[PDB]
Amino acid sequence: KEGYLVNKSTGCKYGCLLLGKNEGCDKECKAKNQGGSYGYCYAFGCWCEGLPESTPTYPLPNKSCS
């Protein structure tokens, strides 16, 4: 399961504006905690491809955000 970097506390995904493979997004989306294989900007959200079934994906099952 892939998906945006949804903040595990607020349920707010880390949204981009500049779509495609964002370098900054790559850093967070393909970060250690994330474990993803790819990190880019889908619909102004950090879409982490290669994501574990353990890594939460927007939106959170606790809280929602924009």
Side-chain angles (χ1 to χ4, degrees), residues 8-54:
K8 302 174 288 177
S9 48
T10 57
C12 213
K13 50 106 164 76
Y14 310 169
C16 311
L17 183 164
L18 184 68
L19 297 162
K21 193 178 187 295
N22 185 272
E23 296 179 283
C25 185
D26 186 271
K27 288 305 176 183
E28 304 178 74
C29 215
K30 223 283 295 173
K32 302 79 63 177
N33 164 89
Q34 312 315 149
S37 308
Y38 206 87
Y40 92 126
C41 290
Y42 183 37
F44 329 102
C46 264
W47 185 265
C48 305
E49 322 192 297
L51 218 48
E53 312 301 283
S54 193

